[PDB]
Amino acid sequence: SEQFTTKLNTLEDSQESISSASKWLLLQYRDAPKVAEMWKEYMLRPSVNTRRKLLGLYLMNHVVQQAKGQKIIQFQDSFGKVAAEVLGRINQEFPRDLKKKLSRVVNILKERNIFSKQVVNDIERSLAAALEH
Description:
This protein is mainly α and 133 residues long. The protein has a single domain, classed as Alpha Horseshoe (Serine Threonine Protein Phosphatase 5, Tetratricopeptide repeat). The chain has helices at 3-9, 15-25, 32-43, 50-70, 73-90, 96-111, 117-132. It is globular and about 40 Å long.
């Protein structure tokens, strides 16, 4: 629902506040397919700063990380799909500093087995493409 954008637009730059938001976003699993699309648009919105995009990335990470604990594939699969594309694209805007921070998020998604091997491979491929172009 629109509650995603409510928490996203009011998303504060702090892990505590980010987790607090994601706690409620776990209830959006019914519309997760659409939430991921909203997240995608946000991440690929030119009116959003690269810092604010990374902040949004942090929010997603918390949601799917908790979804991993809650075993909610509605978030894992949905966000994984769009993440494969987004993560590659936004690295063309992110500076080296924020690109490193991004790669840390990716490492978490992989190492914690949050996203499937298919999704991870798709991410890594798009990341390589981002490095190439």
